[PDB]
Every structure is written in structure tokens, then in C-alpha cells.
């Protein structure tokens with residue numbers, strides 16, 4: 001099953017589970033999967049493994 005990512009607003013430092021770097025910024029720093037909670041950059045979304 002593919003992930004179901006949504007734009008998310010993080011309130012504590014959160015790293016991208018795909019590429020390892022911090023999700024930088026004040027708002028809308030990345031995407032969170034509705035089902036497994038994975039956090040990724042907007043631009044990392046297309047590159048993550050599709051097994052949720």
C-alpha cells in the first residue's frame with residue numbers, strides 16, 4: 001500500500017525519514033503520512049519507498 005502524505009506543520013525539530021536532513025522552516029516544513037507517520041520533505045515524497 002502506498003503512503004498517504006499530507007502537508008504538515010511541525011512544532012518540534014523533525015528530520016526527513018527519506019534523506020536524513022532537518023525539515024527546516026517555521027511552517028509547512030514537510031509531509032506526514034496519515035497512516036504510518038513517516039515525515040518527508042515535499043521534494044522527497046516522490047522518492048520514498050511506496051510500502052506503507
Ligand SMILES: CCCC(=O)O[C@@H]1[C@@H](C)[C@@]2(O)[C@@H](C=C(CO)C[C@]3(O)C(=O)C(C)=C[C@@H]23)[C@@H]2C(C)(C)[C@]12OC(=O)CCC
Nearest residue numbers: 009010011012013014015016022023024025026027029030
Ligand atoms: C521561531 C519560533 C521560535 C522557535 O522555537 O521555533 C522552533 C524552531 C526553532 C524549530 O524547532 C521548529 C521546528 C522545525 C521542524 O523540524 C523547523 C526548525 O524550525 C528549524 O528550521 C530549526 C533550525 C529549528 C526548528 C519548531 C517551531 C517553529 C514551532 C519551533 O518551536 C519549537 O521547537 C518548540 C519549542 C520546543
Ligand SMILES: CCCCCCC(=O)OC[C@H](COP(=O)(O)OCC[N+](C)(C)C)OC(=O)CCCCCC
Nearest residue numbers: 006008009010011012013014032033034035036037
Ligand atoms: C492530527 C495532527 C495533529 C494536530 C495537533 C498538532 C499539535 O499541536 O501537537 C500535537 C501533536 C504533535 O505535535 P508534533 O507532531 O509536531 O510534536 C510534538 C510537538 N511539541 C512537543 C512541541 C508539542 O499532533 C498530533 O496529535 C499528531 C497527529 C498527526 C496527524 C496524522 C494522522
Ligand SMILES: [Zn+2]
Nearest residue numbers: 003033036052
Ligand atoms: Zn505511510
Ligand SMILES: [Zn+2]
Nearest residue numbers: 016019041044
Ligand atoms: Zn528529505
